[PDB]
Design a binder for this molecule. Sequence first.
Ligand SMILES: [Fe+3]
Lengths: 171, 337, 337, 79, 77, 208
Amino acid sequence: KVFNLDRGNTLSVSLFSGVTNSKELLNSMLDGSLKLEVSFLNASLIPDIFPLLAAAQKALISKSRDSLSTRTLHSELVYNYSGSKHITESLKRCGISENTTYILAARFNASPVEMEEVAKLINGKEIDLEELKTHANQANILKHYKITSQELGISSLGDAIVCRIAARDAL
Amino acid sequence: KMIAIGFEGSANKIGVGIVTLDGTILANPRHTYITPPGHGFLPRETAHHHLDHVLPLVKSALETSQVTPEEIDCICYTKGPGMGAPLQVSAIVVRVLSQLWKKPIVAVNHCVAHIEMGRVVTGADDPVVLYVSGGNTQVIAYSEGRYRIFGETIDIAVGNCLDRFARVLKLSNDPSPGYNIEQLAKKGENFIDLPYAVKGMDVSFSGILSYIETTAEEKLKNNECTPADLCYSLQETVFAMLVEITERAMAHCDKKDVLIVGGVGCNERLQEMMRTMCSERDGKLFATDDRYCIDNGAMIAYTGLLAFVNGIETPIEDSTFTQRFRTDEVHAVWREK
Amino acid sequence: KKMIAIGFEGSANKIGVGIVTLDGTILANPRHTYITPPGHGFLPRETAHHHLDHVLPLVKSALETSQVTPEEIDCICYTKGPGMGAPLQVSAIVVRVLSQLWKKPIVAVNHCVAHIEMGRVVTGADDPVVLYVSGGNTQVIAYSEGRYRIFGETIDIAVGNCLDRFARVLKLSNDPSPGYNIEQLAKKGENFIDLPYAVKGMDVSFSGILSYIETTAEEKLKNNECTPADLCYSLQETVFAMLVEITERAMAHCDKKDVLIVGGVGCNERLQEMMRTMCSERDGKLFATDDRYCIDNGAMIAYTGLLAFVNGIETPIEDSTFTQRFRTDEVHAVWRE
Amino acid sequence: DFSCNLDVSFESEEHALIAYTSLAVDKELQPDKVRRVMSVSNNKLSVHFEAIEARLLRASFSAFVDVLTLATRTIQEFG
Amino acid sequence: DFSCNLDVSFESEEHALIAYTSLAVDKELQPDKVRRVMSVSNNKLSVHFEAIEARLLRASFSAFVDVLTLATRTIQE
Amino acid sequence: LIKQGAEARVFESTFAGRRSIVKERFSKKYRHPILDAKLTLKRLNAEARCMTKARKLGVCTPVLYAVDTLLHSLTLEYIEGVSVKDIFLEFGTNGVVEERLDDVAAQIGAAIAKLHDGGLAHGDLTTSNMLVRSGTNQLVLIDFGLSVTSTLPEDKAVDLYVLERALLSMHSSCGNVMDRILTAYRKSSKQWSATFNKLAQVRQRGRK
Ligand SMILES: [Fe+3]
């Protein structure tokens, strides 16, 4: 699905469950064999499309001012969703590891052909963008993001995640 | 017309002011106990200087004003705050003058005198008033008939901070260490980092002074910066911080005009920054001048004139000078009426 | 048994307490000095304050160093004069209180006789004619028929006063003394300047010489024609010539064998050198003690007090007064006869 | 302990009473260490001051003579 | 014109007599402008100063207080 | 443009396809360039930290969407609700509903106690500040511009004093609420004793 962003940009999203070649995906990301730019995130750490849209806005601002701290804009995105100042730990935890078969593949202003060929490249089951609440791993969200029980009683998990993503640079 | 006489001796500066109701000084022989360079003032020798000078000073005030003692409507002494000995000398002389001339003694506060003199000089009706001096660093707003303070140093005043920083650097003492610091800073060209030290609606200067002393001592021997740069950076930092504080004061009480009074008001950088802020926020800073902002008897006499023509008075048996006398205790009956 | 007399010396800014034995040995000589701003002379009031501060610790140090209990002290001696009234009265009060508590007789002692006798017992001289030249005294003393009679002295001012005044004119430092700075600067002198010859008969005058050389110093420093070193050299050589000439005339008149010199001004070296040369020419010896005794101190007075007491002449407790001029000839020697 | 009385002779009764009242209203900083009382008799102003210690007594009399000098100068200027 | 009458506390009578025979026998600076009288009763002093000028009297006060403290500090051991 | 603050500005826009508000701390001209950059960055971090901490204490606040470091902007969720001042004006004009007033006082007292026990003052607890969410009648707090962190009970007492002074200033048309708020704070707080002692001390200070 393609969703609009700021200043007329768009982003294409595709959720896949039961990925069988996750190790091959990680190897290709490491060696850069794939020609198209794409980011793979551990989709279990996502409660809603809204935090991803916020990270997309952050990466768009970084690219527009050409302030991509990481080598690629998609790696900039995956580092952005982590909310930590340590790039290596961010990639290890929030980026895909060898134990993530529930993978989100996204691209910036992607054409339908690019998403179709990406879907051809992946051996998995495509899922919509509404099961996140059902598949959100809230326990590790509270563990990593230090979300208080008082926070949960006045707001949802996604709002706290979005606030932390925004306020990373405030620390 | 109505004329009030006021005595000011709360600091090393001594003043015998004689004023009318319009705000125009008739005479103002102001004298200073000129301390040796590198040294401050102590109550005993300051009192000795006052003993030697006040009678010639009062004679000079009478000769300059040419106003008969009977023409005085009220004789007013600065109750304080300030060091005990000069206020005590002023108390004795005002008691004697009241019992001889048969004239009413009025205790007058100092900050109220500064605010009223500034307001009458610049014609402002009800602005936030910033009184900055050697022993005072105050942001004051009228409220419910009382001059409530909203911005205040908790540890040490900005003027004392400048003074003993200059003494650390051993500046001259004419006409004031602040003036010499300003002259030195006029050649300052380099900025220097100072920590953020504004909390709530108040500022602390003792930590700021300690930090700038440490930096100056570290940089002078290492020739990393000139004292001019140190003075300029300190001046800009403190005045930007005071801009922030008085802007918060503007927001809280919803005030538009701005008045500046006190010794540091003799400077011009404060006026430039304040007028810039007023232009940004559609305000109108009112300017300053030396004869209407330095410690002397004119402002004291003017506040006394207000208090006497309003009705408040103090008997001769109640001529109890105080080392501490807050501004809010003065019930501003003049403005409500 | 060595009877011990406790004495004081406070005739000037030098405060001293003295304990001596029959042979003149000093069991304890604590002493303290007062410093003055340059270009001015010390005033009596602050000198008396300093004397009050230092009088008790001096007696305490004397009793500790001498290791002699105050009971073992046999009599008390107070310096009758000459000297300034305030320190003399402080010493008189202290000696009176000590006498009343310890029940020991009081005796009034002169200062010049003390100088003469202590120099006699220090240098081993038999009985020489003595020139005492200092800031407060400039005289020639010779023993005759039990009286230390005066043969020659200054007629206008003691040359110590003239030297100190010219040092103040030249703005020389008072540390450690203006005389030492004058002597060193003269040692750096290169040019000699003539001065008036003001020796009347066999005595000397210095007021006219001082005025002339002050005028010369002002003219030459204004025109930068010479350094103050030349001025000091000229003054030193001229005054040395005058003093040694009158010393020679007195020595010839008195028909003696050897001569003794004493006083702070006597600390100079050019004098002692050239005058010992002319004494060797005159078949005479030079007696010149160290600077420790040339300056005032308590052990100076103590030995003459011991000499007076051992004979049996006493002094009533009510007559413990002082005077501005306690003349030497008023004391009749009884210990030597 | 330590104490005495001081007198000053004025031109008339009025000046003695003025000095008495003017210095009367002057509170004492340390009532527990010093005390002052006084009388007036004709033009003679007698001031009985009593202090505990010598140094405090001397300082008090020094300040007292100073303020007396102030009062005398003021009266002589405005007799 | 100006005057003061010190009355001073002392332990024993002989202390007052010591202060008398010490200070009183001394002759003061100038009788022309000032007058001084002193007496002893029991262990209590009665010391009266009279002067034309307050500053001269105050100088005398300074000297007298200082010398009395000196005498006490001498007796105390 | 919605409103311009004394030190910053608030703007209306759309973030991530959602209705949003933009609180932009535009560079003021009272500071030198390096000085301005330093204070803007530091106070932006402080505001974000204050929002995070007040969220951690169970007090409802607008949700922080995104932070642009190179533009100094705050993006916040838009809240639908009613102001306390409007409700109190309605009470004064058309009659005070005692049960609604008591519930509001209890809720605001509980929220104030919850914020106060965390050792973080607010300083601007004015009726224009807190809002009540429509439909859910839930209380929310905004405008952290003057928030300062300290453990001194003096600050909490001063905050309560300013709150009651503002309540007096907005007229007693709705009645006296000091008793209700004090009882709510008593029933909600645990260290209320020292806070009320200091509040009484400040009250005696300000009465004169
Ligand atoms: Fe002032």
